[PDB]
Amino acid sequence: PKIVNIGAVLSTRKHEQMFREAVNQANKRHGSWKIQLNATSVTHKPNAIQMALSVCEDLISSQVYAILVSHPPTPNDHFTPTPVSYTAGFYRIPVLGLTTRMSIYSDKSIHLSFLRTVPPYSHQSSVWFEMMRVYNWNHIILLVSDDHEGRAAQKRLETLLEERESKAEKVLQFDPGTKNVTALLMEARELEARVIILSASEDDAATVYRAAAMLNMTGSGYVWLVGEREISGNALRYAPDGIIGLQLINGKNESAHISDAVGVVAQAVHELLEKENITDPPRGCVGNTNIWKTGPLFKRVLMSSKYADGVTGRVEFNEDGDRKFANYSIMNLQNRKLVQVGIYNGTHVIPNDRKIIWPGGETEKPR
Amino acid sequence: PKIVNIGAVLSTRKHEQMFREAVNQANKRHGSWKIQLNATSVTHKPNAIQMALSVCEDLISSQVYAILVSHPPTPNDHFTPTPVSYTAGFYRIPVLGLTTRMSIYSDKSIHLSFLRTVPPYSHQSSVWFEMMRVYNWNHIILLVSDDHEGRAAQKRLETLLEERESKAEKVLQFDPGTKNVTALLMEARELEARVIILSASEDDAATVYRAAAMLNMTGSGYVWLVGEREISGNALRYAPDGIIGLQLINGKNESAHISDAVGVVAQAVHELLEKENITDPPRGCVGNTNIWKTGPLFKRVLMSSKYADGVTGRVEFNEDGDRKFANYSIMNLQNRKLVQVGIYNGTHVIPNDRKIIWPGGETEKPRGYQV
Numbered sequence: 001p002k003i004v005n006i007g008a009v010l011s012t013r014k015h016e017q018m019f020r021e022a023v024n025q026a027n028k029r030h031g032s033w034k035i036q037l038n039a040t041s042v043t044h045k046p047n048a049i050q051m052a053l054s055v056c057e058d059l060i061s062s063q064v065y066a067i068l069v070s071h072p073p074t075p076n077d078h079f080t081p082t083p084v085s086y087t088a089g090f091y092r093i094p095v096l097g098l099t100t101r102m103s104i105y106s107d108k109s110i111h112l113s114f115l116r117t118v119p120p121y122s123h124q125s126s127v128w129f130e131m132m133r134v135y136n137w138n139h140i141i142l143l144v145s146d147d148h149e150g151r152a153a154q155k156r157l158e159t160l161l162e163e164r165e166s167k168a169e170k171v172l173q174f175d176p177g178t179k180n181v182t183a184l185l186m187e188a189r190e191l192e193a194r195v196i197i198l199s200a201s202e203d204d205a206a207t208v209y210r211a212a213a214m215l216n217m218t219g220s221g222y223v224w225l226v227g228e229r230e231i232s233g234n235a236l237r238y239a240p241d242g243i244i245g246l247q248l249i250n251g252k253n254e255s256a257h258i259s260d261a262v263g264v265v266a267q268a269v270h271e272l273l274e275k276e277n278i279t280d281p282p283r284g285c286v287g288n289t290n291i292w293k294t295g296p297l298f299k300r301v302l303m304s305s306k307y308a309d310g311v312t313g314r315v316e317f318n319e320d321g322d323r324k325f326a327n328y329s330i331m332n333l334q335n336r337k338l339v340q341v342g343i344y345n346g347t348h349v350i351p352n353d354r355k356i357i358w359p360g361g362e363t364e365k366p367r
Numbered sequence: 368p369k370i371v372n373i374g375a376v377l378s379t380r381k382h383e384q385m386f387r388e389a390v391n392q393a394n395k396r397h398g399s400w401k402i403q404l405n406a407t408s409v410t411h412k413p414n415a416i417q418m419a420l421s422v423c424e425d426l427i428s429s430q431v432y433a434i435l436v437s438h439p440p441t442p443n444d445h446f447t448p449t450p451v452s453y454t455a456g457f458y459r460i461p462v463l464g465l466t467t468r469m470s471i472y473s474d475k476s477i478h479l480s481f482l483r484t485v486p487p488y489s490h491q492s493s494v495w496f497e498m499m500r501v502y503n504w505n506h507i508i509l510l511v512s513d514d515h516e517g518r519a520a521q522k523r524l525e526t527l528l529e530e531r532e533s534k535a536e537k538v539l540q541f542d543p544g545t546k547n548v549t550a551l552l553m554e555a556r557e558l559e560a561r562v563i564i565l566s567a568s569e570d571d572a573a574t575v576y577r578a579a580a581m582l583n584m585t586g587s588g589y590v591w592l593v594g595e596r597e598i599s600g601n602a603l604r605y606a607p608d609g610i611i612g613l614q615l616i617n618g619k620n621e622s623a624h625i626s627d628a629v630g631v632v633a634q635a636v637h638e639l640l641e642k643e644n645i646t647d648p649p650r651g652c653v654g655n656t657n658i659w660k661t662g663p664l665f666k667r668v669l670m671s672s673k674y675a676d677g678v679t680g681r682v683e684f685n686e687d688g689d690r691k692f693a694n695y696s697i698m699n700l701q702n703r704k705l706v707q708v709g710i711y712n713g714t715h716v717i718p719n720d721r722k723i724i725w726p727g728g729e730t731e732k733p734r735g736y737q738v
């Protein structure tokens with residue numbers, strides 16, 4: 001009866017409980033004959049020192065094969081995984097994030113021991129790419145954050161725009177923390193195109209919306225295309241009517257992602273302990289300066305795993321650990337109410353019977 | 368020929384060249400017939416995402432043996448090495464700290480590729496213990512911030528007090544960054560002990576200094592014994608006359624450490640290349656998830672290295688993580704002006720000629736102890 005520990009850092013005590021269930025439920029699902037999956041976990045810490053310290057003292061110390069990182073889906077939490085990733089990445093222990101959508105985790109270096117059940121915001125540009133053409137606009141204005149996250153959605157959208165009739169036109173970028181995006185929009189206003197795509201924080205989207213309206217870029221022939229987040233929080237409070245944003249279906253549904261992540265990890269642990277040339281994970285974090293050799297192997301099996309019937313539906317991973325084929329519900333601001341006017345899944349936009357109102361009030365697609 | 372690369376993250380463009388010259392000088396001093404030291408460096412980055420990325424794209428990408436980390440010595444930059452230590456720790460490349468004194472880096476098991484030519488703030492408790500040896504304080508209230516830093520200072524002082532017939536008369540901890548301390552200091556004032564040891568951030572120190580001056584804990588009987596930081600910035604603007612604080616000699620001196628680090632990294636890299644089974648450091652960051660097995664070795668070489676005639680004293684690193692063992696200087700607040708009233712060698716507190724006015728303008732030494 002081989003005991004295999006699985007660690008998680010989660011939001012609440014009830015989620016710790018939800019994890020303990022989902023694990024030993026998936027334990028009976030697979031078969032407790034050969035291996036028996038064990039759940040050990042800790043409540044999340046917002047203080048990234050105290051957090052990194054907990055991953056050693058509470059998780060890695062008790063022989064863990066992989067860690068799940070969860071936290072409140074708030075914009076001043078979306079980085080509580082960085083310490084966990086760095087600490088566990090030290091020994092090559094795969095970290096399975098399930099809330100955070102920050103693109104820095106999907107980079108080709110730094111977070112090499114990381115994968116997630118939810119796509120980064122930079123992938124919302126794959127929807128915008130389909131959106132363009134479905135509604136036949138193909139000359140756009142683009143403004144991104146000029147922090148990593150912003151350029152990550154620019155670099156992507158513009159890659160898809162290559163090889164294609166549609167071109168970038170003019171890419172503009174602002175300093176992340178600014179009030180005063182006036183002279184930047186002022187320059188965009190006199191430009192050719194009037195379908196604006198935005199990538200910003202909740203409060204930064206708010207600042208451009210606020211200043212866009214003050215410069216009369218808010219209505220008529222203008223189209224505003226954003227993602228989720230640019231229609232969350234204060235961004236919603238100051239958004240122009242007729243803006244098109246997105247929302248990741250099941251994105252904030254933490255109980256779902258605990259269920260699916262335990263799904264793939266259980267499924268991939270059995271897959272792993274079949275190879276029979278594997279080492280046990282280190283119980284270290286104390287003068288232990290060596291990795292476990294079968295670390296990255298487990299990580300490769302992890303992110304090449306295929307797992308349909310998931311509660312977030314058909315969960316498989318990226319070239320570098322991102323969720324593949326995720327469902328975004330297309331949103332639209334009609335009279336201060338976000339109404340589902342479409343739905344993107346994997347690829348392709350599929351609108352419903354309900355009609356879109358465009359920025360300014362006038363129905364019927366602008367140019 | 369044979370080129371050996373050394374990385375560095377430093378404060379300015381002119382500190383970068385300061386580093387490059389120190390590497391060139393280390394070659395002209397060492398052998399340099401077999402191996403020739405080289406200098407690749409980047410400037411420091413506040414934003415921790417951009418710093419981690421720079422360590423990969425600029426430093427690790429240039430096949431680096433060890434990375435030096437410096438930065439402005441502001442209380443806002445003291446954490447800048449965490450992304451460097453994590454990113455380079457990922458491959459077991461040794462990171463050498465020059466300016467940060469945060470105690471978290473000294474920890475067992477969080478930063479295992481980290482070195483520093485400067486001791487942590489928690490080590491100031493070694494100085495306070497000696498301050499109590501001289502000046503016979505045997506009854507103390509010790510208030511520390513209830514974070515890792517404050518707790519690190521109380522754990523080390525309590526250890527030192529344990530192996531002696533003593534402990535803190537009472538230990539008090541406040542929530543880092545609170546603006547109400549009035550309550551805590553109330554139960555402190557009614558105690559027997561009258562010498563107060565504080566371990567707080569520079570802004571937290573000011574909060575307690577005025578909450579203390581108000582409940583009347585500044586005059587006469589009291590002794591205020593703190594460390595650097597509790598006498599820096601907003602603290603010291605609000606610190607009571609007669610407060611005694613520490614100041615790490617050549618702590619804020621970048622060029623002095625840029626030199627000494629290059630010195631010991633040069634001294635140790637020669638030692639390493641003297642050995643059998645040495646593998647080259649990782650070429651790049653991208654899609655690379657193996658370490659270099661000699662990384663841990665090289666770090667153990669670095670830590671057991673000795674270096675006399677630094678500029679900053681005798682350079683050597685202890686076992687715990689690694690931290691220098693060298694001189695501090697005792698400062699006293701007189702007429703709102705910090706004047707040196709003593710100096711601490713590696714071991715003993717040794718008073719100077721200059722006389723020392725205690726809290727509340729008092730001329731002669733108090734004893735704490737209720738009076």
Ligand SMILES: *[C@@H]1O[C@H](CO)[C@@H](O)[C@H](O)[C@H]1NC(C)=O
Pocket residue numbers: 003005038039040041062063
């Ligand atoms: C299994 O998990 C429990 C907590 O759920 C933990 O206390 C125990 O140590 C784990 N088993 C092993 C063998 O470590």
Ligand SMILES: *[C@@H]1O[C@H](CO)[C@@H](O)[C@H](O)[C@H]1NC(C)=O
Pocket residue numbers: 180181182183184
């Ligand atoms: C900042 O905004 C002010 C008024 O809102 C304006 O006068 C100034 O030109 C703006 N500059 C930039 C760079 O946005």
Ligand SMILES: *[C@@H]1O[C@H](CO)[C@@H](O)[C@H](O)[C@H]1NC(C)=O
Pocket residue numbers: 216219220221222
């Ligand atoms: C603002 O410009 C838009 C053109 O997009 C137009 O609908 C509206 O009449 C303008 N209003 C003013 C006051 O200039």
Ligand SMILES: *[C@@H]1O[C@H](CO)[C@@H](O)[C@H](O)[C@H]1NC(C)=O
Pocket residue numbers: 253254255256311
């Ligand atoms: C989480 O997911 C469930 C379905 O699995 C659904 O009721 C809802 O969207 C979320 N509810 C809670 C309580 O998290």
Ligand SMILES: *[C@@H]1O[C@H](CO)[C@@H](O)[C@H](O)[C@H]1NC(C)=O
Pocket residue numbers: 325345346347348350
């Ligand atoms: C939505 O995605 C599915 C499965 O990934 C794909 O086959 C299909 O093209 C999309 N929807 C429609 C209506 O075709």
Ligand SMILES: *[C@@H]1O[C@H](CO)[C@@H](O)[C@H](O)[C@H]1NC(C)=O
Pocket residue numbers: 370372405406407408429
């Ligand atoms: C040596 O360092 C310089 C920068 O000072 C760097 O550009 C060069 O590529 C390095 N040479 C080797 C062989 O690594």
Ligand SMILES: *[C@@H]1O[C@H](CO)[C@@H](O)[C@H](O)[C@H]1NC(C)=O
Pocket residue numbers: 547548549550551
């Ligand atoms: C909070 O502070 C005010 C004065 O600063 C005081 O009236 C009150 O007693 C304090 N309470 C606590 C718990 O510090």
Ligand SMILES: *[C@@H]1O[C@H](CO)[C@@H](O)[C@H](O)[C@H]1NC(C)=O
Pocket residue numbers: 583585586587727
């Ligand atoms: C008040 O303050 C002075 C110095 O600030 C001090 O000597 C005295 O003991 C304190 N207490 C009273 C009751 O005055």
Ligand SMILES: *[C@@H]1O[C@H](CO)[C@@H](O)[C@H](O)[C@H]1NC(C)=O
Pocket residue numbers: 620621622623678
């Ligand atoms: C650093 O040490 C040097 C001697 O190397 C000394 O002259 C100076 O005080 C320090 N540097 C600065 C900039 O103060």
Ligand SMILES: *[C@@H]1O[C@H](CO)[C@@H](O)[C@H](O)[C@H]1NC(C)=O
Pocket residue numbers: 712713714715717
């Ligand atoms: C001061 O310096 C050294 C430590 O480096 C030590 O040998 C000596 O005993 C110390 N104190 C005195 C009073 O000499």
Ligand SMILES: [Cl-]
Pocket residue numbers: 173174175178180181184
């Ligand atoms: Cl700007």
Ligand SMILES: [Cl-]
Pocket residue numbers: 215216
């Ligand atoms: Cl206009």
Ligand SMILES: [Cl-]
Pocket residue numbers: 412413414417
């Ligand atoms: Cl920066």
Ligand SMILES: [Cl-]
Pocket residue numbers: 540541542545547548551
């Ligand atoms: Cl408090």
Ligand SMILES: [Cl-]
Pocket residue numbers: 582583
């Ligand atoms: Cl009183």
Ligand SMILES: [Cl-]
Pocket residue numbers: 486490491493691692693
């Ligand atoms: Cl010391």
